[PDB]
Nucleic acid binder design. Sequence first.
RNA 1: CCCGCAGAAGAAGCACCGGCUAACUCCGUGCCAGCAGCCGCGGUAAUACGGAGGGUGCAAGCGUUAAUCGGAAUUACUGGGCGUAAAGCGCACGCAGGCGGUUUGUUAAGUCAGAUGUGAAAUCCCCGGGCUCAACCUGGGAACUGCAUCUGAUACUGGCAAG
RNA 2: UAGCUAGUAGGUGGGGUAACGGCUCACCUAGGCGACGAUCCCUAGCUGGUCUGAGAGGAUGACCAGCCACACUGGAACUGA
Lengths: 121, 205, 78, 129, 80, 155, 70
Amino acid sequence: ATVNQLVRKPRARKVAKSNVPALEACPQKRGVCTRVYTTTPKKPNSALRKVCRVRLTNGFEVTSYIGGEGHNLQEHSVILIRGGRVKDLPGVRYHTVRGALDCSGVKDRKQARSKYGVKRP
Amino acid sequence: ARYLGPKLKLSRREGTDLFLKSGVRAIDTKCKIEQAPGQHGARKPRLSDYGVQLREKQKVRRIYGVLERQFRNYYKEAARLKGNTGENLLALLEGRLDNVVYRMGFGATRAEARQLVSHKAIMVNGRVVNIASYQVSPNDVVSIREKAKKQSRVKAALELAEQREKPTWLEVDAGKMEGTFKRKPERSDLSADINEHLIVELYSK
Amino acid sequence: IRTLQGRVVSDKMEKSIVVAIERFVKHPIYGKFIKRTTKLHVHDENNECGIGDVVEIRECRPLSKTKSWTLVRVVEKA
Amino acid sequence: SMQDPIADMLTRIRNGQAANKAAVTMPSSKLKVAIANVLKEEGFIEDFKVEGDTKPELELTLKYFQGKAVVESIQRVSRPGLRIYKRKDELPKVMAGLGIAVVSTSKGVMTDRAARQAGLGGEIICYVA
Amino acid sequence: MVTIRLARHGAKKRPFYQVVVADSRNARNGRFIERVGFFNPIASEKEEGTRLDLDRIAHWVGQGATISDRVAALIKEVNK
Amino acid sequence: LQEKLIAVNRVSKTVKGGRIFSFTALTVVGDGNGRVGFGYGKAREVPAAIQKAMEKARRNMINVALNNGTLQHPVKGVHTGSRVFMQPASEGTGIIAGGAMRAVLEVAGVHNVLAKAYGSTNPINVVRATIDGLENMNSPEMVAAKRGKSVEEIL
Amino acid sequence: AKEDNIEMQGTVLETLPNTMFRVELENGHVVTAHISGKMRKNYIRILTGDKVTVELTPYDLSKGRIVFRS
RNA sequence: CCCGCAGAAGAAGCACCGGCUAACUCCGUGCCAGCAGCCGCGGUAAUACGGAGGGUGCAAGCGUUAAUCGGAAUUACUGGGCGUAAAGCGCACGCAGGCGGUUUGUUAAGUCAGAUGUGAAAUCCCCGGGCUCAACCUGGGAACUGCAUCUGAUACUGGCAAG
RNA sequence: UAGCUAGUAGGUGGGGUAACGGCUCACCUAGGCGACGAUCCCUAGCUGGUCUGAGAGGAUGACCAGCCACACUGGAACUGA
Ligand SMILES: [K+]
Ligand SMILES: [K+]
Ligand SMILES: [K+]
Ligand SMILES: [K+]
Ligand SMILES: [K+]
Ligand SMILES: [K+]
Ligand SMILES: [K+]
Ligand SMILES: [K+]
Ligand SMILES: [K+]
Ligand SMILES: [Mg+2]
Ligand SMILES: [Mg+2]
Ligand SMILES: [Mg+2]
Ligand SMILES: [Mg+2]
Ligand SMILES: [Mg+2]
Ligand SMILES: [Mg+2]
Ligand SMILES: [Mg+2]
Ligand SMILES: [Mg+2]
Ligand SMILES: [Mg+2]
Ligand SMILES: [Mg+2]
Ligand SMILES: [Mg+2]
Ligand SMILES: [Mg+2]
Ligand SMILES: [Mg+2]
Ligand SMILES: [Mg+2]
Ligand SMILES: [Mg+2]
Ligand SMILES: [Mg+2]
Ligand SMILES: [Mg+2]
């Protein structure tokens, strides 16, 4: 670009979009589970990974991951979601927060306890 | 807010005496100084350039008994002051009251000296100062209070200090139990083993 | 005193002209010198100015909705 | 068309040095001569001469030290598409003082060093390293 | 009217006052015309507790500025 | 002579049977008083590669006119996709450089320098760019000699 | 330390794309099942009408893993 | 704030240890359960999952999420590109616009120089002072890169006149 | 979003205001604004500053201080410096 071209039309900023639109720049949001089910991952990996569909307070309807071994969630369970992609599950951009509202901590966990909502033994 | 764990562990990880024991006994007699602190201690894995900088930083911290937030703040000051950031950082740490009390010889270790300061047994220019971090300035007079000149540990420490080499930038009278911080130390008068450029590089990253 | 020198670009009003003042200003970002134009509605009592004349003007009290400048003298007739 | 004669002079020196020419020639002008004087006094060229009356020609004698050319770099700064002016204190240093910037001041064309000693800003014609 | 009074700065339990000329209707710590000195009520032994510019105070008094009771007392102290 | 290993990489050639692996080693060597050279070496296993590189580095030394442990002036260097910038710095700044530039600058004996690498940071090209930088760097004495002046006139 | 998986028997009704199968179990429920990693590593082909062992989970009674083909 | 009393007495957790990235072993599980920022890990000897022992990093906090700038020379004024990687309009003419060979005079708009006024205080920065230190508070300076006016300079750009 | 404007742009004279002024009215003239982006739509209180950055930039305007606007929603005046 010449000087004269930039004077006529300046350099434009490329606009970056969020990976976590449904949060609307909140650190967490609350929602009611409408479905709780399992899903198989993409090619290299193999599993039955645990997920829920949740309707947030702001009207968005998203899929969230349920981390750790075993969970107590059902349809109509009130949970708190945070941001975080699960790489091998298409279109899962949110994690459930274990040990907040109706989501229990993981049974018998001893390491990384704060990440799974588990009180000190 | 202080390290209250096993001391020689620290010496062994860094692989040098950090002067964390009195020096009544040689360190080899008390621990395996050559070998690193645990199950996989004997194997000597090769260290990254990040690793070399980290260990240098942690060596100096563990000598002077300073946690990371406070050490970070010392670096910012040394960087701000005119002159060499590296040379300034060491001078700041040498200024600390707990250090000065040790280097004068009223405590056996820096941790002992730190207990004297904290427990209200030291004065600077006449007045009680119970803050380990307090920066001592040129022509200050550090002294023990009348109530704690009797203490048995202070007398003992003065004997141990005679066996150690005497700092030039201080001047003590052990009968009076007081001494004078004459000047700030130079880089010459401190130990050549420390490689402070590594610390400057670490924080400049 | 405190005057601007300009150029008449209209005279189709009773006792009033439009004058265009031309400035040469460095661009804030890109550093090139650019031409910029201020257009003022000026008062001219004796309709003594035509399109193309170089006039000299001074700021005064409000004379109408859009006029706060008045003619000092003509510098060059067209 | 030709819209920058000074850039043309600098390009003739640059291309001439790279081709190991003894001398380069061009249509003269009073500004080109002013610049040629600064280059001669700072020791970047050997000599110059103008010859002709109606269509005068400036000829510069280029320099080589131990094979390699003396003018390592020569760059037009101010140009028709973008003019550059600097105040006294903002005058540029080229190669941390080892090179020159040629400056058009109200007391004539001179080096950036000479312009600082006079306390003059001006237009930055070119860098010569 | 215009008044010469104390604006309260410093920290909790350690007041430091700026002496300011202001339109009386403005907030204590708000818009002022000129600062004409300071008063440190908990100043130490060797430290200057009070400094006033008596000339600039005289100027403003000439133009019909009022003095607050506390600033009046400070002027007396400086005028031993 | 100080000596540093910058990178080791495993490379592969396909043949009738399968893949023949091999090792590459990039190294630099320097006196620490403005002499430096780099070497690149290939062999079937790492230690032989490193040895080959170090032998090459010692025979391909160039000179760099330093100014009391920093550069004479700001410098640019280019090779392939690699563009490097380096400028002089104050005492106690250290080597504010990244990747391969550090290793070249250390062993050359440049204690104080600010640097930045643009474009490709591929080590072989970054090293070549850096040394081309340093070798194309004039001292006051050189510039004065070209222009037919003394150092006092230049500075 | 993991929760127990109930194994049922069933017939392959339909082959879906990429080692996925509709399987009618003995209880009468149809589930979408995928081949195990052991069976795909050891090249055990599954076809329509085959009888299979299906590992199920209580979290989702519509999905399963085929772990054996008789 | 000071003095006395009693007795080590009332007071340590959180994340991490495959590479990036400081820190490794055993047992359980067997592409399952699970991990994951990216690359990836798990199909029987898993330093990558879960527990344990050991270790590393921070510490009255430690992690996770959200959000901004950085690294990103990845909108490039400083500081990038367009034969084949994304990118030369199918080709021309041409109004507005940008740019303009060479000499002299004149002007002084751009430009340059000096001065004057102004640019609130706080904030940032420097040298000091005060709270046992620090944070914090505070004296003075510097800075506020700007804007306006006046007086000058005339090389360069512009205007005007003649070539 | 490419055309917008009729008290609209200017004039003369009454009235009006603490005060200049289409501020208002009667008449007269036919103007005024716009690719140096008018008009229209969306978003938004502005600044000293703040965060980030080597810098040039980018993001931001909570606390403190300056300025502006609003007081359940839409109108209106009265009293008074
Ligand atoms: K896998
Ligand atoms: K410093
Ligand atoms: K550019
Ligand atoms: K045209
Ligand atoms: K001129
Ligand atoms: K109107
Ligand atoms: K009227
Ligand atoms: K701003
Ligand atoms: K309203
Ligand atoms: Mg703390
Ligand atoms: Mg490691
Ligand atoms: Mg195993
Ligand atoms: Mg950028
Ligand atoms: Mg590119
Ligand atoms: Mg193609
Ligand atoms: Mg293409
Ligand atoms: Mg074409
Ligand atoms: Mg011309
Ligand atoms: Mg001028
Ligand atoms: Mg100020
Ligand atoms: Mg009227
Ligand atoms: Mg009237
Ligand atoms: Mg008006
Ligand atoms: Mg709003
Ligand atoms: Mg940057
Ligand atoms: Mg009234």
